[PDB]
Amino acid sequence: ASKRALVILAKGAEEMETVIPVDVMRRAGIKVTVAGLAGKDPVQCSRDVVICPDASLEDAKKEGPYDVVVLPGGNLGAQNLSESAAVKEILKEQENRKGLIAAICAGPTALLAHEIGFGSKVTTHPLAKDKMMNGGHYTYSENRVEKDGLILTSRGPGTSFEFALAIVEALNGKEVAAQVKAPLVLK
């Protein structure tokens, strides 16, 4: 069976950090559900790109479990994720079942909000470090992608490909990640 990914899409998400992982994961043969936090209506992202989700989160969360739960960044998107009881339940269940959780840019701050993965080495966007580190519940890294067991984090739009390929490597292995990578013309 193919691996499955849930990408939780909130108003104010960073559209690059949403689309790059969705696209790359689909290139890797992962079945990706783009789930709208607020419902099935189109989502206005941080830079005004409007993305139509595959499903509401309400519906998608009934079709679990997923091999990865992905949290895009965008400050306002991440705040929305941080405020959601549905997201809290999903991430706690994912942590409890030892499933991967992946978050980029400000996205990792939603892990703090929901008390997920404390003790992990993490990265974030430089501008999100102080938020993430409030209370000292994580150990900070400046690596472009950081993975500490089942918590996978990354820094910003420019690390999105590396983040997505790390997800692919974790789920489908190094060879699939290398095969997906080559046609992308990465630096």
**x-marked contacts with Cl ion along 123-142 as a string, rule CB under 5 A:** ---x----------------
Question: Catalytic site residue 105?
Answer: yes
Residue 65 preceded by cis peptide, ω within 30: yes
Question: Catalytic site residue 45?
Answer: no
Write down the residue that tokens 């479990």 correspond to: 65
> Restricting to residues 167-186, which ones interact with Cl ion according to CB under 5 A?
183
Distance CA 93, CA 62 (A): 12
CB of 88 to a copy of itself, least distance (A): 26
Q: Which is nearer to a copy of itself, 91 or 128 (CB)?
A: 128
CB of 18 to a copy of itself, least distance (A): 8
Distance CA 154, CA 161 (A): 10
Taken in order 183, 166, 68, 140, the sign of the CA dihedral is negative
Kindly state the helix (H) or strand (E) to which residue 145 belongs, with its residue range: strand 145-148
Q: Which residues bind a copy of itself (CB under 8 A)?
A: 14-16, 19-20, 22-23, 26-27, 34, 42, 46-52, 125-127, 144, 155-159, 161, 183-187
Q: Which residues are catalytic?
A: 105, 125
